[PDB]
């Protein structure tokens, strides 16, 4: 089995930049007929994947002249001589030289911008949820950049790294930042067992976490 490896999983770029996206095979991908079936696809948000390059270096008809492909042995490369706003999305490589046919994880082309500290907002369980017998403490880490962030919870000073659901937004088409919601879910009784609920954010803009908290009984 040939496994296709793509890096990085996220490539931050500025428009007008010449970029190279890499893809590696776990072993050689030459078909028995001499051809190397390495293809590159661009999946534009909302749409389906579309062919860009076939057989390592052949630009498919209708594909812009800024896209090219190259590679040999186990290293293949996708080039975009000058990036536009339409080129943003995820790029997938794929080898069809050997069975099973393999897809790479994909590389998301995203926009670079100035660092942005996240705005951390913490919200205790709604009085309504409590009646139903549940307790969900949500916390929003919004409009931050870069996209790498760590959210830690601490119930009464003690870290509670269990039962937390996190979701992330795609880069904002407007300001180009990222946002994320982290929902800790407990029970009315377990929730009523603690007082201090805390949400700490470790962004490359803090190291010493952005902390937002509250006390069940008071503030």
């Amino acid at each position: 089995d040939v496994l296709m490896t793509q890096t990085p999983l996220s490539l931050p770029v500025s428009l007008g930049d010449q970029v190279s996206i890499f893809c590696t095979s776990s072993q050689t991908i030459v078909h028995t007929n001499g051809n190397t079936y390495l293809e590159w696809y661009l999946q534009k948000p909302g749409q389906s994947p579309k062919l860009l390059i076939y057989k390592v270096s052949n630009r498919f008809s209708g594909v812009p002249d800024r896209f090219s492909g190259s590679g040999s042995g186990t290293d293949f490369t996708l080039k975009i001589s000058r990036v536009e706003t339409e080129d943003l999305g995820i790029y997938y490589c794929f080898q069809g030289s050997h069975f099973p046919l393999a897809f790479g994880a994909g590389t998301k082309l995203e926009l670079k911008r100035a660092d942005a500290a996240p705005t951390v907002s913490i919200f205790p369980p709604s009085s309504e949820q409590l009646t139903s017998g549940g307790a969900s403490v949500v916390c929003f880490l919004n409009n931050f950049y870069p996209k790498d962030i760590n959210v830690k919870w601490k119930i009464d000073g003690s870290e509670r790294q269990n039962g937390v659901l996190n979701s992330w937004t795609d880069q904002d088409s407007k300001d180009s930042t990222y946002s994320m919601s982290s929902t800790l879910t407990l029970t009315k009784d377990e929730y009523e067992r603690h007082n201090s609920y805390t949400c700490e954010a470790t962004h490359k803009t803090s190291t010493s976490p952005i902390v937002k908290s509250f006390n069940r009984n008071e503030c």
Binding site: L51, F103, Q129, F140, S167, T169, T185
Partner: protein, 220 residues
């Protein structure tokens, strides 16, 4: 104009069966290789099966035996019989025409969604997220809405019926335990809220659900 239209996608319980169809146009099957490729919720692309212009069939070991590609050359329709279905088989299915010994996936269809789950139609739980006494001590105020345990997807969330658009962040749903949970945050000026009315309008069509929750300041 070449066309590929997938149909048959839908909700199927584990171990169950489903038949996907793909109506083609612009070309003939005897001249092109056909394949099915799926994109899982994680956005991962996986090859499911392909049939050559001649009839040769190929499956990856995980699909082999459970799924079956067949084609109606006469009515130029490609199929994919699915059985022994698992939750990981949940993905968007695309049929694709390729060029034999030239390019595998030259032309993709928009796809059809197949969701494998034992979950039952459950209306969402919509809770109003009011800020803690701390946050509110500034220029802006971020509010929120928790839309818990609903099935199936999707639900539609707005603020003040759409009146509140800028400064909103609606997060992608996630399965918590066979049920979907989603959350949205809305940031506005301090003099905007609670001075002005702010409501989270959530609808879950599948369960004929249309609920509204006004965000009120907490405190005794």
């Amino acid at each position: 104009e070449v066309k590929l239209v997938e149909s048959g996608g839908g909700l199927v319980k584990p171990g169950g069966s489903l038949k996907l169809s793909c109506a083609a146009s612009g070309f003939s099957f005897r001249n092109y290789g056909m394949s099915w490729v799926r994109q899982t919720p994680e956005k991962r692309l996986e090859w499911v099966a392909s049939i050559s212009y001649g009839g040769l069939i190929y499956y990856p070991d995980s699909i082999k035996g459970r799924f079956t590609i067949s084609r109606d050359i006469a009515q130029n329709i490609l199929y994919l019989q699915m059985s022994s279905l698992r939750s990981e088989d949940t993905a968007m299915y695309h049929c694709i025409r390729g060029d034999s010994f030239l390019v595998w996936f030259t032309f993709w269809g928009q796809g059809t969604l197949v969701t494998v789950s034992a979950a039952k139609t459950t209306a969402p739980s919509v809770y109003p997220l009011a800020p803690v006494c701390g946050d509110t001590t500034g220029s802006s105020v971020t509010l929120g809405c928790l839309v818990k345990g609903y099935f199936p997807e999707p639900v539609t969330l707005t603020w003040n019926s759409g009146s509140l658009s800028s400064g909103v962040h609606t997060f992608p749903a996630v399965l918590q335990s066979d049920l979907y949970t989603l959350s949205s945050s809305v940031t506005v000026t301090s003099s905007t809220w609670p001075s002005q009315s702010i409501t989270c309008n959530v609808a879950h069509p599948a369960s004929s659900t249309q609920v509204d929750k006004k965000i009120e300041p907490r405190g005794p």
